[PDB]
Design an enzyme around this catalytic site. Sequence first.
Site, mmCIF file in Angstrom:
data_model
loop_
_atom_site.group_PDB
_atom_site.id
_atom_site.type_symbol
_atom_site.label_atom_id
_atom_site.label_comp_id
_atom_site.label_asym_id
_atom_site.label_seq_id
_atom_site.Cartn_x
_atom_site.Cartn_y
_atom_site.Cartn_z
ATOM 1 N N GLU A 182 -4.329 31.807 11.324
ATOM 2 C CA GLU A 182 -2.725 31.948 11.203
ATOM 3 C C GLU A 182 -2.265 31.912 12.547
ATOM 4 O OE1 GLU A 182 -1.974 35.394 9.168
ATOM 5 O OE2 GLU A 182 -2.247 34.527 6.964
ATOM 6 N N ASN A 214 16.727 22.768 -0.527
ATOM 7 C CA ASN A 214 16.137 23.372 0.690
ATOM 8 C C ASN A 214 14.912 22.663 1.166
ATOM 9 O OD1 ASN A 214 16.366 26.105 2.544
ATOM 10 N ND2 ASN A 214 14.017 25.648 2.098
HETATM 11 C C1 LIG Z 1 5.965 24.722 11.830
HETATM 12 C C2 LIG Z 1 5.258 25.655 10.579
HETATM 13 C C3 LIG Z 1 5.921 26.559 10.157
HETATM 14 C C4 LIG Z 1 5.606 27.499 9.179
HETATM 15 C C5 LIG Z 1 4.351 27.419 8.826
HETATM 16 C C6 LIG Z 1 3.495 26.522 9.396
HETATM 17 C C7 LIG Z 1 3.906 25.743 10.452
HETATM 18 C C8 LIG Z 1 3.176 24.512 11.254
HETATM 19 C C9 LIG Z 1 1.949 26.376 8.992
HETATM 20 C C10 LIG Z 1 0.818 25.680 9.664
HETATM 21 C C11 LIG Z 1 1.914 25.511 7.815
HETATM 22 C C12 LIG Z 1 1.456 27.828 9.030
HETATM 23 C C13 LIG Z 1 2.232 28.680 8.049
HETATM 24 O O1 LIG Z 1 2.173 30.020 7.954
HETATM 25 N N1 LIG Z 1 3.636 28.276 7.937
HETATM 26 C C14 LIG Z 1 4.616 29.029 6.998
HETATM 27 C C15 LIG Z 1 5.743 29.277 7.454
HETATM 28 N N2 LIG Z 1 6.477 29.789 6.549
HETATM 29 C C16 LIG Z 1 6.103 30.519 5.678
HETATM 30 O O2 LIG Z 1 7.108 31.131 4.763
HETATM 31 N N3 LIG Z 1 5.064 30.194 5.335
HETATM 32 C C17 LIG Z 1 4.096 29.660 5.910
HETATM 33 O O3 LIG Z 1 2.856 29.337 5.454
HETATM 34 N N4 LIG Z 1 6.293 28.430 8.515
HETATM 35 C C18 LIG Z 1 7.818 28.951 8.944
HETATM 36 C C19 LIG Z 1 8.741 28.330 8.203
HETATM 37 O O4 LIG Z 1 8.701 26.735 8.155
HETATM 38 C C20 LIG Z 1 10.079 28.833 8.893
HETATM 39 O O5 LIG Z 1 10.140 30.379 8.747
HETATM 40 C C21 LIG Z 1 11.402 28.198 8.269
HETATM 41 O O6 LIG Z 1 12.604 28.646 8.770
HETATM 42 C C22 LIG Z 1 11.314 28.144 6.520
HETATM 43 O O7 LIG Z 1 12.364 27.500 6.139
HETATM 44 P P1 LIG Z 1 13.669 28.084 5.515
HETATM 45 O O8 LIG Z 1 12.881 29.023 4.388
HETATM 46 O O9 LIG Z 1 14.525 28.741 6.361
HETATM 47 O O10 LIG Z 1 14.345 26.893 4.724
HETATM 48 K K LIG Z 2 14.215 25.108 7.154
HETATM 49 MN MN LIG Z 3 16.711 26.777 4.451
#
Ligand SMILES: Cc1cc2c3c(c1C)C(C)(C)C[C@@H](O)N3c1c(nc(O)[nH]c1=O)N2C[C@H](O)[C@H](O)[C@H](O)COP(=O)(O)O
Ligand SMILES: [K+]
Ligand SMILES: [Mn+2]
Lengths: 498, 498
Positions: free
Chosen positions: A278, A164
Site C-alpha cells: 500500500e 462518479n
Molecule cells: C492514484 C491512486 C488513488 C487511490 C488508489 C491507488 C492509486 C494509484 C491504488 C494504487 C489503486 C492504491 C489504492 O489504495 N487506491 C485507492 C484509493 N482510494 C480508495 O478508496 N481505495 C483504493 O484502493 N485511491 C484514492 C482515491 O482515488 C481518491 O481518494 C479519490 O478522491 C477517490 O475519488 P472520489 O471517491 O472522490 O470520487
Molecule cells: K474522483
Molecule cells: Mn467523486
Amino acid sequence: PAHLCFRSFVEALKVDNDLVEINTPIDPNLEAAAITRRVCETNDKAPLFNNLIGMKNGLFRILGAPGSLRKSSADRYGRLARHLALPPTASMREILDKMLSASDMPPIPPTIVPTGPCKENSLDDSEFDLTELPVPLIHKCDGGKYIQTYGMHIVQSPDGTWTNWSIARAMVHDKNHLTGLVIPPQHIWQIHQMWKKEGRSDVPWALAFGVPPAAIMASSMPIPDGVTEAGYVGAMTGSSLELVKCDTNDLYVPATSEIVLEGTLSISETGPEGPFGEMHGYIFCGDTHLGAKYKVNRITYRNNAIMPMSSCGRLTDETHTMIGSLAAAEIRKLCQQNDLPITDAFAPFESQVTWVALRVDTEKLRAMKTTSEGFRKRVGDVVFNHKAGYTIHRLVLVGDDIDVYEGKDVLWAFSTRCRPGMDETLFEDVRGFPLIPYMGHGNGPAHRGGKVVSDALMPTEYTTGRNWEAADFNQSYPEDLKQKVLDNWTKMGFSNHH
Amino acid sequence: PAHLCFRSFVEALKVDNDLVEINTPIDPNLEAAAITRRVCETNDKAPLFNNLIGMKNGLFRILGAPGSLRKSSADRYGRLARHLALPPTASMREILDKMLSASDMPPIPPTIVPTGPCKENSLDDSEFDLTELPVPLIHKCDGGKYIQTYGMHIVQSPDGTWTNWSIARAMVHDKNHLTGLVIPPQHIWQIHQMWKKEGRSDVPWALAFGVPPAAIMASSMPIPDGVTEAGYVGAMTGSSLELVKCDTNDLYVPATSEIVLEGTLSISETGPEGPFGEMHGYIFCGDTHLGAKYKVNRITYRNNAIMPMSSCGRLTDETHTMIGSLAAAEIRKLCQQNDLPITDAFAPFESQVTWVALRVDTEKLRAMKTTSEGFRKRVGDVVFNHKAGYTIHRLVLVGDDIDVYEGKDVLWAFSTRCRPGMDETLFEDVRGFPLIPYMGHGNGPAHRGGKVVSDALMPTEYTTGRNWEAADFNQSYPEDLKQKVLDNWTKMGFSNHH
Ligand SMILES: Cc1cc2c3c(c1C)C(C)(C)C[C@@H](O)N3c1c(nc(O)[nH]c1=O)N2C[C@H](O)[C@H](O)[C@H](O)COP(=O)(O)O
Ligand SMILES: [K+]
Ligand SMILES: [Mn+2]
Ligand SMILES: Cc1cc2c3c(c1C)C(C)(C)C[C@@H](O)N3c1c(nc(O)[nH]c1=O)N2C[C@H](O)[C@H](O)[C@H](O)COP(=O)(O)O
Ligand SMILES: [K+]
Ligand SMILES: [K+]
Ligand SMILES: [K+]
Ligand SMILES: [Mn+2]
C-alpha cells in the site's frame, strides 16, 4: 492530444525521452512490478512492457509508473504535466491550480459518440477468463493479482444525476469476478450505499483502464459530493469528453479507453480481498478481509491494448504524487471557502503524504485577532470533518516564508516553530484513515481519531508580524554581498538547472 | 598527526582536496561568514581565508566550516573523521563509537611540556585590543562580533579535581572583555556556580582556538559531570595530550593551540550578549540579554595563527553535525547503562537536530513484556531528566529495520508507525532548551517542558515480532529476481559510489 488520449500520452512520454520500451519477454508475476518499483524509487523513465508473458488475443501490454517523478528538478513533475496539457517544467502549484480550475466553472458535459478505439475488440462471458490474462502480481505477499491500480471505476447514482469516476484497487477473484476496496467516505462507497438502500439490483458498473490522462487525474481527486467527474474534466480541459456507451449496460466510457470491463458491483456479495502493498509503504502478509465483489460480463479493448500499473509502496509513486497532492489541492480550496487565510497546501512526500502543510497569509491572520488554540481548532474542524481531509492525519500551519512544496522547509518549520503538545490540538472524534499502519494495525480504533493540527506559526505571526530573519545565506547577508559571493564563487575555487 | 594538531588538520584538508585557500582580501565583516554559510548550505570545501582585512601582528587567518559535510556520500563525514584519525569514509556509527570508546577506559591524563607553538607570540594587556582584531560579524543582525564559535573554554572546579573543556559562544564586549552564554545545565555553568558559591574570586579561565581536533570534538560532547575532557581525549586517542601552562594563571592549554586567551570569567559582572544566528536557523534581531562576562589579560598565539569559525544556522554546519550527533551518542550509552535495549541513536538533520531516533533491539524488548505507554515513560524519564537529553525535544523509538542514521527512513517510520497523541507521551516537567524558537520565543515557559517521546514501534514489536514486510524493491521481491533486474538494468535502457 496526450491529455485526452492515453495512447497519445504514451507517445508523449516516448518523445520526452521519458519511456523505456522493453520488447523482450517480461513476467507479470513480480518482474514487471519489480522493474516498476525500482523506477519509482529512483525517479527513472517509465517502463513500457511490450512483451508480457501470457499476453493473448491482444491483452495486454503494461505501462508502469504513469504518474511518478522524473530525475531532474527542472521537469520533476513532467509526467503529471503531460496528464494536463501543461509544459513539462510546470510547478506543483501550477498543476494543482489546473486541477482546481474547474471548481468555479460550469461543467462541460460529455459528448456521446457512436464508437471509438475501445470497441476495436470484444470478449463475451464465454470467451474471457480473468485468471488467464497477464494480470500482475505486484508485491510478493499480495493476496491477489491486482489488475486494477490505475483504471477508473464508473458508477452512477440510482436516480442518474451523479456519475462518479474514481480509482480504488481491485484484484482478480476468479474467471469473471474481482474483489476490491469500497470504503467510506469514498464516492464509490456512497453510491454503493444508495443502491443497497434501494435494494432492487446490483450496481451497474464499468472499469476503464488507459483512460484520458486528464480523467485519471480527476479520478484521483476528492472533488465534491454529487459532482460528475466527466463535466469537471470537461471544464478543466475546455473540451467535452467523448464517451461511448457500454455494450451490456447504459454507462458511458471514454471512447479511447485501452481496456473496458463491464458488469456489476454486488449489493450483497463479498469475497477475500488483500493484502496489498500500500501507499504508506507496507504489506501485512496474510491480512485478508472481505471486500466488495464485482462481476465482469464483457471486456472491450483497443488493438494492442496497454494496461497502466502503479507498483505502489515506498516513495515515490502515483499514491504519493496524486493522492497526496490532489487531496492537498482540495483542502486548500476547502479552507479558503471556509474563510480561512490559506494560500497553498501540499502533502510532503517525507510524511508519506500523511501530513498536509498549509501556508497562511499572516497579514490576514493578524486581522482576525485570534490565537493558536482557536485557529488550530477552527482549521482542524473544517478539514478533518470533511472527506477531502480523510487521508491526512497531521496538518502543519506555517507562515508566509515557507514554501510548502519544499519538504525540507516544511520539516524545518515544523521542527523549530511547533512546541510539541502545547502548540497542537489532537482530534480523536473524526474519521481516521485505516490504511495508515498506526491506524489499522495500531493501538487504537482503526477508523477514528489519530489526527492533529500542529501550529508552526510563531506567536508574533498572530499579532505584530514575524520578528526574526533566517540564519541562512539568503536572509542573513545584504544583497550586494550575496551577489559578490555568487559572482566570485567559481573564481575562488568552489563548485557550481536542466 | 591531524587529530592532535590543528595546523596539521588544515594540511590534511588540503591534501584531501577539501579546502579552498583564498589569498585575496576578504572582509571579516560578513564576507568570510557569507562564503562559509554558502559552503555549509552546499557541502562545499572548507574555506581558508589567508588574507583577512584588518589582520595585524599575525592575528589572524580564518578557517570556516571545520566540521561540516562533504558533497559525496562516500566521504560525507570525512571532515569529522579527520578530527579523529579515522578513514575519511568512516560511517557515523564509527565516528560516534570512537567518541564513546573512552567511556569504559581509564583516563590518560595530559602531559605538561615547557613550551609549544601557542607561545610563539604574546600580547599583554597594554598591547592588544579585541576591537582592533579581525573578529567576524557572522550574521548581519548579530549583536556582536562572535570571536568564539569553535574554540574551547577551559575552567576548573575550585578544588582542582575537574577541568572542563567545552564550546560555548562568545562575542567581543570591549578592548579586553567578551560576553557569552553560560547557561544551565552546561558544565561551564556548573563550574561557574561552584566559584560563585565560594564567593572569593572570579573564575580562572582560558579560551583556546585551533586546538587538537580530537579535543574540540570532546568539547562538543556531553560526557559526564566531573569528567576531565583532557583525560577522555587521551584515552580515546591512546595518547596523553601535551599541554602548556598559561602565563598569567595555572590552567593548561594544548601546546599547539593557534590562539589562547587568558583571563577570568566574572562571578559578579554581566554584559549585553546576543542575538546570534543560532543552530536552529534563526536570529531574533534586537533580542539582547545579559550574559556572562570574561576579562582577557593576555593573548598568546602561533605564527600565522588560524581562527576556526562556525558560520552556523540552517543546515548543515558544526551545530548539527557535532552538537546533535555527539548528544545522540551520549544518549545511546545512557540508555544502555539504564538497561534499555537501544542499539543506536542519531539526531536527524531534518529535525534541525531537535529529535533523536533510538533504534530498539526488539528481541530484547519482547523479553521485557511491556507496553508502549510504560516503555515511552521509562525512556523519556531516563533521557529528559539527564543533561545529555538537554538539547533534544523529541525522541522517536524505532524497531530494528530502521537505520537511524538515514533521515528518510526515520521520517518514514515516524510518519507511518506513531499515532499522534495515543502513541506519544508529553513531558512538561523537564528542563527545556530555550534556544529552540518554540521554547525561548514560543507560547510556553522558555526553560521547561515541550518534550515528547513518540513511539514508532508497531504493536507486535512488543509481543510476537514484526508482522509486515516493506512495499519496497528490497523486501517485496525475491533475491533472484532483484538481482536479475539489477543485472539487466542498463541493458533494458535505465540509468545507473565515490
Ligand atoms: C492514484 C491512486 C488513488 C487511490 C488508489 C491507488 C492509486 C494509484 C491504488 C494504487 C489503486 C492504491 C489504492 O489504495 N487506491 C485507492 C484509493 N482510494 C480508495 O478508496 N481505495 C483504493 O484502493 N485511491 C484514492 C482515491 O482515488 C481518491 O481518494 C479519490 O478522491 C477517490 O475519488 P472520489 O471517491 O472522490 O470520487
Ligand atoms: K474522483
Ligand atoms: Mn467523486
Ligand atoms: C559545536 C558547537 C557547540 C555549541 C555551540 C557552538 C558550536 C559550534 C556555537 C557555534 C558556538 C553555537 C553555540 O550556541 N554553542 C553553544 C553550545 N553550548 C552552549 O552552552 N552554549 C553555546 O553557545 N554548544 C554545545 C556544547 O558544546 C555542548 O552542549 C557540550 O556538551 C558542552 O560541554 P560540557 O558542558 O558537556 O562539558
Ligand atoms: K507555534
Ligand atoms: K564537553
Ligand atoms: K506506535
Ligand atoms: Mn564536560
